[PDB]
Amino acid sequence: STPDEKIVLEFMDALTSNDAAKLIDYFAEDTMYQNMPLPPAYGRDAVEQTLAGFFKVFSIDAVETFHIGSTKGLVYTERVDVLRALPTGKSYNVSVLGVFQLTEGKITGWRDYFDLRE
Amino acid sequence: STPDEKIVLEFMDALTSNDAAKLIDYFAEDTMYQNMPLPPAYGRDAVEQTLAGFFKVFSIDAVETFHIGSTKGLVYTERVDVLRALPTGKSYNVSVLGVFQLTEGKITGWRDYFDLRE
């Protein structure tokens, strides 16, 4: 595990906190999140708002990471998220790839590719 | 145009209002919206909240409908939406298929399939 992979794994562990204020601490000011293929959330504040909005409708009940690696400095990690819809109580399992760019220990770019098959 | 197709076309015309309170008038209490493959918004109130949340981050600047038809009572309609992200001012064109179920002139189900290719 490289230092960047370590940080990404810590962030993955933290997802089940469902706490945007806690999670945003991993991000640089100059950052972005893109949930493919939607337009990105530009800047740290937009990323925080995106997470906070998500946690008003879903709980991340569990994250099971099954792969992590790096190529050309970018960290690639794959997991299944157990997502529970708060207004219904129904739970869903979905696989997702996260691709992370870090600069001096902070996340400067995050791209997610969720499984979009039915 | 069947009576149901006419209603769906009125609804499509109304999208550029960016007004969830106006748009929800087309929906029955017993309704749902599913933006595929995400979990559905169950019930009229959830549909309204979904639209209202969307309009806080995007403007639908234009809708160009290029197909409408019906099969087995369901209305199928395809369009390109011009979506402008309010926090950035940037605009995006995206194709989408909407499938509508109507009961007594009100929408009881709505499924969207947006183009999810990069």
Ligand SMILES: O[C@H]1CCCC[C@@H]1O
């Ligand atoms: O990976 C995260 C990305 C943002 C919301 C929940 C998901 O599990």
Ligand SMILES: O[C@H]1CCCC[C@@H]1O
């Ligand atoms: O057609 C789209 C336009 C943007 C809001 C939701 C709807 O499904």
